[PDB]
């Protein structure tokens, strides 16, 4: 039956515990306060607790998932009414989010078998196309009968409108002011370039997501994902893809200028201990380069540099550069390169480049147009990716004149400007 399974699943919600503490119960209680209508789940926790759901969810995931959705909705209704009775109408289904670490399978080793099952894999991300919408609950009226009805779609964001509620075929108009919709996006993926055959190009695959599993990723961020090998439409052929059911990403891949700004409280005590120690300067000078010798004078400047300086804005707009500017000058050896190599590790959000700009890395704003619609969009730049951060350079001698002009103006005002044919820009460097 299905109710035996739904009960064996609902028991896992409130009757599971580890480390002598409830996990999913209070997680749901916190989520309802957050107004999240979703959760997180680990499928490793379900193998030991119960084996009546794993071996059947493996092969019939689409058949078993909506049952779990409805069970979560039931738990939510109970806890909602009880919480309203405790302190202080519309509760739609909750998306289920899960992950795993059992294994990873590459795109190369796939086949036409284990289709519609659940799989694991790795890759790299490219596409962020558009927030294409789907419907979840939309109302209908018949144009002649004026007969109101309703429809709701659940998971496939199978059936079509009713063909007959004389009015004839196609008697229904679609309302929008009283309808409901969700978002999804078409995401791509391609294997690791380092694990490929020598000759051929790589192969990619498409996927889709839903309400709270969207917008989580930006290209370049290596991710491992788990989904279902589903199908839609030679002699007779249907396209393969994957439907997302669980996504895990690195906490923070290539530096994000929108980084964390609210630190924890436990660190503050030792932060202030180090602040009040009179040996702070000596500790920093000793530790900024543990495997390096001499040049204490040079190492005593990096500490001044990293902490920036006095940001001062006057009522005329003529700001003073909050940070400082430095220039090594030396012969081979003398660690003139090793410090620069190391500085990126320590720096929270900063970039490193060589002269003339590195491979496909404009030393400044190298703007171009869109592959789609042929429109203008600022692309990037070594002097703006690290906004609010330090920049490391080597081989400063061999610069192009145009490349050097912009960086030379940045070294004194830290605000590049480009005014080509159509686009006019004032993009802040602050580095």
């Amino acid at each position: 039956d299905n109710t035996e399974i739904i009960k064996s699943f609902k028991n896992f919600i409130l009757e599971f515990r580890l480390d002598s503490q409830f996990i999913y119960r209070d997680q749901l209680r916190n989520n309802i306060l957050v107004k999240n209508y979703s959760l997180t789940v680990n499928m490793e926790h379900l193998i030991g607790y119960n084996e009546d759901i794993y071996k059947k969810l493996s092969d019939e995931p689409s058949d078993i998932i909506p049952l779990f959705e409805t069970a979560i909705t039931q738990v939510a209704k109970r806890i909602s009414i009880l919480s309203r009775a405790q302190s202080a109408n519309s509760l739609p289904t909750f998306q289920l989010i899960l992950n795993s670490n059992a294994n990873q399978i590459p795109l190369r080793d796939l086949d036409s078998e284990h289709v519609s099952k659940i799989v694991r894999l790795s890759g790299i991300i490219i596409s962020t196309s558009v927030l294409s919408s789907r419907a979840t609950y939309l109302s209908i009226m018949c144009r002649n009968c004026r007969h109101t009805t309703s429809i709701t779609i659940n998971n496939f964001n199978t059936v079509s409108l009713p063909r007959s509620c004389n009015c004839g075929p196609d008697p229904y108009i679609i309302i929008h002011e009283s309808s409901k919709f969700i978002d999804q996006q078409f995401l791509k993926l391609q294997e690791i370039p380092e694990l490929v055959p020598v000759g051929e190009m790589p192969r990619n695959l498409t996927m889709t997501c839903d309400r709270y599993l969207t917008n989580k990723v930006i290209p370049g961020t290596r991710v491992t994902i788990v989904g279902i090998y589903s199908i839609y439409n030679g002699v007779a052929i249907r396209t393969p893809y994957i439907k997302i059911l669980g996504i895990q990403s690195d906490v923070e891949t290539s530096s994000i200028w929108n980084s964390v700004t609210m630190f924890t409280e436990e660190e503050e005590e030792e932060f202030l201990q180090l602040s009040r120690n009179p040996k702070l300067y000596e500790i920093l000078t000793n530790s900024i380069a543990p495997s390096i010798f001499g040049n204490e004078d040079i190492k005593k400047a990096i500490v001044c540099l990293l902490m920036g300086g006095s940001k001062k804005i006057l009522p005329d707009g003529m700001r003073l550069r909050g940070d400082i500017n430095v220039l090594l000058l030396g012969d081979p050896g003398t660690a003139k390169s090793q410090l620069l190599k190391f500085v990126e590790k320590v720096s929270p959000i900063a970039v490193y480049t060589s002269g003339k700009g590195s491979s496909a890395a404009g030393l400044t704003a190298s703007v171009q147009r869109d592959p789609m619609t042929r429109e203008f969009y600022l692309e990037g730049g070594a002097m703006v990716l690290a906004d609010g951060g330090v920049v490391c350079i080597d081989e400063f001698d061999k610069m192009r004149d145009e490349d050097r002009v912009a960086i030379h103006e940045a070294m004194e005002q830290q605000t590049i400007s480009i005014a080509k044919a159509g686009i006019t820009t004032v993009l802040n460097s602050r580095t």
């Binding site: 409130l14 009757e15 119960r25 209680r29 109970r78 806890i79 009880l82």
Partner: protein, 242 residues
């Protein structure tokens, strides 16, 4: 091989099976060998092949082998290439009442017993709907006592389903269709076997009803509730903090 066996063992829905699968294989082989037998959707190319396979080996049974336009065409082409109770004096067949009994998903032995009852005692009838309806209802009540006991909602749902299937709004007539058949069919040995099998005996167990009627007070009228009920109910309030 999978689909061939799927269709061949669909006939029920010793040597028969083996010889039939061999016959179907070789017949399909002969039909597809030459370029003379084309434009034939495999959607239905294992039906009259099975019919003629039955015809060939030793014995042939006309009924339920053809069970349509192109059926005869393919046969020739291959064989050349080689309310409901007011109505008075209604009629019935095997499969009509088999369908009416199979809408509940009841077993086949009960349906066959009802069919035997009909074909033995359908000579002095006024409306066979009444007798068949009563028979199937009193089969449902006897076989489904467990789920009815654990869920008193079923009673209304089943009665509504069998009131809508016969297109009526009044139900006392259905009540009569039940009690009259109970009166009529009350003393047959196969009915006895069904009674001992599914242990209804008016919806109550034998070992309880004997003491209920013998004149004792130890008879277990279960106004109280079983211990396991309380044991499993405790869990509901165990988690009341949420």
């Amino acid at each position: 091989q999978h689909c061939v066996a799927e269709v061949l063992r669909l006939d029920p829905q010793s040597g028969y099976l083996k010889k039939l699968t061999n016959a179907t294989s070789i017949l399909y082989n002969t039909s597809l060998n030459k370029v003379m037998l084309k434009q034939d959707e495999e959607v239905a190319r294992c039906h009259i092949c099975a019919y003629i396979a039955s015809q060939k080996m030793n014995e042939k049974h006309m009924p339920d082998l053809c069970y349509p336009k192109k059926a005869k065409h393919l046969m020739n082409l291959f064989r050349q290439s080689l309310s409901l109770l007011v109505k008075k004096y209604c009629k019935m067949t095997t499969e009509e009442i088999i369908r009416l009994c199979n809408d509940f998903e009841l077993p086949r032995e009960v349906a066959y017993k009802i069919v035997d009852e009909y074909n033995i005692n359908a000579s002095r009838l006024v409306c066979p709907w009444q007798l068949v309806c009563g028979l199937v209802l009193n089969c449902t009540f006897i076989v489904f006592n467990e789920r009815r006991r654990k869920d008193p909602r079923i009673d209304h749902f089943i009665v509504s389903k069998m009131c809508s299937l016969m297109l009526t709004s009044k139900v006392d007539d259905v009540i009569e269709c039940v009690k009259l058949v109970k009166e009529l069919i009350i003393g047959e040995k196969w009915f006895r076997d069904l009674q001992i099998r599914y242990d209804d005996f008016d919806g109550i167990r034998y070992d309880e009803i004997i003491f209920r009627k013998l004149g004792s007070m130890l008879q277990t009228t279960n106004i109280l509730v079983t211990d396991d009920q309380y044991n499993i109910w405790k869990k509901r309030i165990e988690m009341d903090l949420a």
